[PDB]
Ligand SMILES: Nc1ncnc2c1ncn2[C@@H]1O[C@H](COP(=O)(O)OP(=O)(O)OP(=O)(O)O)[C@@H](O)[C@H]1O
Ligand SMILES: Nc1ncnc2c1ncn2[C@@H]1O[C@H](COP(=O)(O)OP(=O)(O)OP(=O)(O)O)[C@@H](O)[C@H]1O
């Protein structure tokens with residue numbers, strides 16, 4: 001149970017944007033789209 | 049061929065139903081008769097080359113010289129029902145029949161096979177391109193049908209990929225795959241490397257490094273193909289040719305030698321099962337075999353010598369077969385970090401990276417890129433960083449002579465290469481060799497083979513050291529390797545829980561020493577007792593040795609507490625020991641092992657489902673492609689085949705840059721700049737022309 | 743057929759037909775498929791167990807031969823580890839089946855020059871053989887169920 | 889595949905399978921290129937019948 005909790009959290013972070021909830025599949029139409037979205041567009045550190 | 053190449057250049061950057069492609073189709077229709085004549089010329093000789101090899105044709109062949117009469121050829125060819133009468137007459141005319149009307153079909157069939165190959169391939173490429181970009185012109189299906197044999201012939205060599213092109217659109221690229229490249233890609237070792245790479249990336253990789261990793265894998269695979277080609281098989285000169293023949297032999301048969309070593313170890317150990325120890329000769333004892341045959345003692349010595357020799361040969365084969373790839377990968381990563389990052393020019397790793405600190409020995413060596421293909425990495429690093437950090441400083445860092453660059457650009461020198469061992473002596477780059485040997489000695493496979501060596505040699509000092517080689521089955525057998533990985537998967541957890549068990553047993557030992565010391569008399573004697581808990585160390589040994597191994601805990605071993613002032617305290621002590629130590633902690637260990645089993649299985653399943661559900665290149669799921677029947681299968685076999693990207697990289701490397709097309713030059717430039725934006729990401733040809741195709 | 747016919751030669755060959763319940767009952771068939779699912783793994787891990795027990799047998803023969811006297815008699819001893827084959831049989835027969843490993847069967851090492859060596863021998867045998875490998879087998883069965 | 893070689897030339901190879909003309913189809917498909925008489929011997933057919 002503990003292992004699958006950790007895996008679930010990791011996959012959620014690597015698959016959806018923490019802010020807007022849009023999945024990585026939409027952003028990935030553009031190359032590295034999700035990476036740029038989570039580093040520049042909707043970075044939670046930036047909201048902080 | 050040149051004219052068809054010009055036409056293909058006209059089709060560059062051509063959309064579906066583009067007007068240049070439609071004009072090309074109208075041209076081909078306007079010259080339909082001549083195009084059909086060309087296609088009939090190609091298919092006739094393609095069919096001839098395969099007919100001459102038929103047993104039906106060989107039945108007609110009767111002359112012992114290997115010739116056939118014209119009349120026999122005439123009656124044989126029409127029996128196949130593949131040519132018309134005029135075509136058979138034309139083939140007879142083209143046959144160089146002698147005055148005796150005798151035909152050498154062996155050379156007749158092969159006469160035009162080689163001259164017509166390149167033009168045949170380009171005609172096939174042209175027809176494929178036009179068919180895929182003008183999918184709704186019925187005038188072109190006729191040409192495709194007339195070229196059906198040509199297209200079927202060149203199907204294994206017609207490589208196609210898709211890229212995100214210069215025009216911000218997905219473009220389809222057609223190129224050529226060679227027989228040698230395809231055959232090398234089909235080798236079992238290469239297929240295993242591909243499976244391992246796919247597993248690594250899909251399992252423990254992100255979506256960002258995927259294409260860089262794939263291209264690095266392609267480069268490594270190209271190098272492995274070169275090594276395989278080199279080791280493949282079809283007084284100083286004599287000894288050198290024999291030495292390289294021997295080294296290639298060891299390299300080719302490395303795995304058979306490995307299996308032979310394992311088999312020899314099993315045989316040795318089976319002999320060793322017959323050992324016996326006796327005081328009488330065959331106050332110290334004698335060890336000797338106990339068998340009736342009388343041949344086991346000689347057989348053991350012979351097998352020990354043979355096994356040591358086989359181990360040595362395995363070492364040599366490994367350093368001739370895998371070590372080149374090890375050094376290649378290391379040189380390649382070091383060079384790219386020097387150039388694109390300035391590892392030792394700007395950042396200077398901080399002594400905690402043993403790899404980076406060890407790589408400092410190779411920078412100034414004359415021969416730093418020995419296995420890596422790039423012999424101009426130092427020039428590139430200098431041209432990139434010398435202005436800002438000092439050209440002379442960079443030259444000293446990389447061991448370059450600033451004066452020699454100009455003369456090397458000026459002209460080429462042809463010195464005397466004297467084939468003498470004395471002259472070869474000083475030519476050894478000792479610093480490079482020390483670095484290379486350090487890299488090799490820090491390699492797991494080489495270390496394992498060296499340990500195999502050492503234990504095999506110690507087996508001669510004492511034959512029971514050959515028992516250690518029985519452990520080789522774990523690495524020899526993928527099944528054992530998976531099973532033992534199911535233990536090593538949670539090794540840190542296992543060590544930590546054993547430590548926790550030691551701590552809890554120590555706490556129980558403290559309690560027992562302070563209070564329950566009476567019960568630890570393990571002597572049935574009445575006048576000399578053996579108290580196991582009159583000392584911390586003795587009591588702790590006793591607990592960790594007997595209490596953990598007992599089924600019911602320490603209470604099984606120590607004395608009965610019934611009828612004592614401390615009965616309840618001691619029973620709580622015993623029950624809690626049994627529960628925390630015997631039940632819970634051993635359950636934790638077994639659970640870690642079982643969980644590792646499940647984790648490995650679900651990793652394999654995840655990789656398999658990912659491969660069977662998404663395209664490895666573009667990331668589009670199988671559900672989109674499956675709208676068309678077998679859409680995902682065709683997409684992964686024709687449109688976005690990763691083997692085709694590997695083959696395309698090989699093709700670009702081999703081809704001349706002056707001969708590169710526009711698309712090829714584009715991909716080549718972005719390859720050299722390490723920019724992977726040409727890989728179609730989230731988009732494909734079918735998606736881009738959904739409207740026109742549908 | 744063959745076992746039914748042999749049952750007339752000896753009626754106890756009819757006991758073999760009691761095994762038919764595995765194929766007769768889908769429940770038994772599923773349960774036994776839960777064992778056969780990882781049969782290659784089970785055979786391989788039993789082989790690995792044989793190898794590790796053999797390594798322990800080699801160590802015991804070379805060093806701990808004194809402790810393998812399984813005779814309460816004082817003048818005629820029964821030494822179980824004066825031979826490779828006898829010692830290996832002894833280990834694979836009693837050490838694997840013992841709850842605490844081979845140390846449960848062989849003599850006490852207290853008050854010997856090799857006490858610490860022998861206790862390490864015993865604890866490692868118990869952990870690698872009794873705990874880890876049997877846990878692997880049971881885990882293969884449970885994983886096949888899942 | 890090696891055991892199936894015993895049944896090819898049998899008079900009654902498709903006994904349970906519904907297709908009693910499989911040999912005729914195989915001959916009509918491959919006999920021109922590989923030899924009609926050779927195929928007939930392989931499948932145990934009589935070309936005259
Ligand atoms: N809004 C968001 N802001 C930041 N990260 C986000 C957001 N939504 C999703 N993520 C994901 O959170 C993940 C966590 O990023 P982070 O750099 O903290 O992890 P990491 O890989 O463990 O870090 P590092 O390797 O730099 O130590 C990112 O990889 C990203 O995919
Ligand atoms: N771009 C891609 N190129 C190739 N295969 C891809 C790609 N994307 C996904 N795949 C999937 O990778 C799978 C692996 O194919 P492969 O032929 O190597 O496997 P296999 O079935 O084990 O092989 P074989 O049975 O021929 O030995 C394919 O079935 C395919 O669905």
Ligand SMILES: O=c1nc2[nH][nH]cc-2c(=O)[nH]1
Pocket residue numbers: 266267270421701
């Ligand atoms: O640009 C390259 N040049 C090469 N030569 N040999 C292998 C090469 C490669 O991957 N890339």
Ligand SMILES: [Ca+2]
Pocket residue numbers: 705706707708
């Ligand atoms: Ca040019």
Ligand SMILES: [Zn+2]
Pocket residue numbers: 017018019020021022037042
């Ligand atoms: Zn967002």
Ligand SMILES: [Zn+2]
Pocket residue numbers: 663664665666667668683688732
């Ligand atoms: Zn794709």
